[PDB]
Amino acid sequence: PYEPESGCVEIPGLSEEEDPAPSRKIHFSTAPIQVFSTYSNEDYDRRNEDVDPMAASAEYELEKRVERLELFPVELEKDSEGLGISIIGMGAGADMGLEKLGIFVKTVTEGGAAHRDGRIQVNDLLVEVDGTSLVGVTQSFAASVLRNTKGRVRFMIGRE
């Protein structure tokens, strides 16, 4: 049942200035300054705790490399044996830890769905799987995405 309210208060205006140049065309009002009311902090929480420049920049370095790659869609039929691939997370540079990784194809199982399709190969980058980005993610997140895929699975793939 919110009821916004508006109002205006006047405060002292700009001071008269000492000797302004005669060639100056603009001038400044000495009239009172209108101070209008906007929302209080209680009414309008302007904080935003979701900004994380450190995580963003870590993701971004990884993203910059992928657009140097040529991207191609792949569609695989997921059967009883799964997708027929294993994955490995690699960092954007040396010794980056576990948080923001590129997800690479480590293994293509002989006789598996990826193998007989022929397109996906070892060291391919998994960019997107069933509409979910895997660029700058943990390996466990990637593994969860891949486990949850069903039927005809839609990929975007990058290759060095």
Interacting residue ranges for another protein, rule: CB under 8 A: 2-4, 6, 8, 11, 14, 17, 24-29, 31, 33-41, 43-48, 50-51, 53, 56-57, 60, 133
CB of residue 127 vs another protein: minimum separation in angstroms? 11
Residue type, 146: L
CB of residue 117 vs another protein: minimum separation in angstroms? 26
Bridge partners of 90, per DSSP, are 102
Tell me how far apart the alpha carbons of residues 5 and 145 are, in angstroms, rounded to a whole number.
48
C-beta closer to another protein: residue 50 or 110:
50
CB of residue 101 vs another protein: minimum separation in angstroms? 18
CB of residue 20 vs another protein: minimum separation in angstroms? 8
Tell me how far apart the alpha carbons of residues 27 and 63 are, in angstroms, rounded to a whole number.
50
Place of tokens 């960092």: 91
C-beta closer to another protein: residue 58 or 83:
58
C-beta closer to another protein: residue 25 or 68:
25
Report the residue count for the chain: 160
CB of residue 68 vs another protein: minimum separation in angstroms? 16
Residue 81 DSSP class: T
Of all helices (H) and strands (E), which one includes residue 108? strand 102-108
C-beta closer to another protein: residue 24 or 68:
24
- Report residue 121: phi and psi, to 5°: -135, 160
62: exposed, middle or buried (Cβ count in 10 Å: 0-12, 13-18, 19+): buried
C-beta closer to another protein: residue 1 or 118:
1
